[PDB]
Ligand binder design. Structure first.
Ligand SMILES: Nc1ncnc2c1ncn2[C@@H]1O[C@H](COP(=O)(O)OP(=O)(O)O)[C@@H](O)[C@H]1O
Ligand SMILES: Nc1ncnc2c1ncn2[C@@H]1O[C@H](COP(=O)(O)OP(=O)(O)O)[C@@H](O)[C@H]1O
Ligand SMILES: [Cl-]
Ligand SMILES: [Zn+2]
Ligand SMILES: [Zn+2]
Lengths: 69, 69
């Protein structure tokens, strides 16, 4: 089944690239209509970044959750 | 830059999973509005499949080409 290929790709993508900042915590994410949005940082790092004023790592990649558009 | 993260993910995704049928040729693909469609087979295998009547491996996964939706 094709939808599973997307799912496993996304599971893998989320598992193998940790937070860009601390490099250990997994990343924050949220679901939005039909996309999975993976943010560049974990929450701890993201809130920290606001506190220290660095917007360098801000950002996300949106992923289509299904095999067909 | 966030768009590059998507691009490199897609380049990697295309490189590391070959044709599902022959397992060696890279897969057929085509671009469609803002998505990259990766088919499950190379062309050689796909045309072959039509010839032999197996629709088992027919299919594709569509990928958003950009980081933002
Ligand atoms: N954990 C995080 N790591 C990096 N960037 C983040 C994180 N959380 C939010 N952001 C950034 O905050 C901005 C607004 O995010 P979001 O609330 O997803 O957008 P919208 O306002 O369209 O709903 C975006 O630049 C997003 O990348
Ligand atoms: N190389 C291939 N490998 C596997 N399936 C394919 C291949 N080429 C086309 N198909 C299948 O043919 C069907 C029609 O494909 P396509 O022309 O992309 O759709 P559309 O008719 O919406 O433009 C889809 O099921 C697609 O997966
Ligand atoms: Cl996607
Ligand atoms: Zn972190
Ligand atoms: Zn093949």
């Amino acid at each position: 089944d094709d939808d599973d290929k997307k799912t496993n790709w996304l599971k893998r993508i989320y598992r193998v690239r940790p937070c860009v900042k601390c490099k250990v915590a997994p990343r924050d994410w949220k679901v939005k209509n039909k996309h999975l949005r993976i943010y560049n940082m974990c929450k701890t790092c993201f809130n920290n970044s606001i506190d220290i004023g660095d917007d360098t790592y801000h950002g996300h990649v949106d992923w289509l959750m299904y095999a067909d558009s």
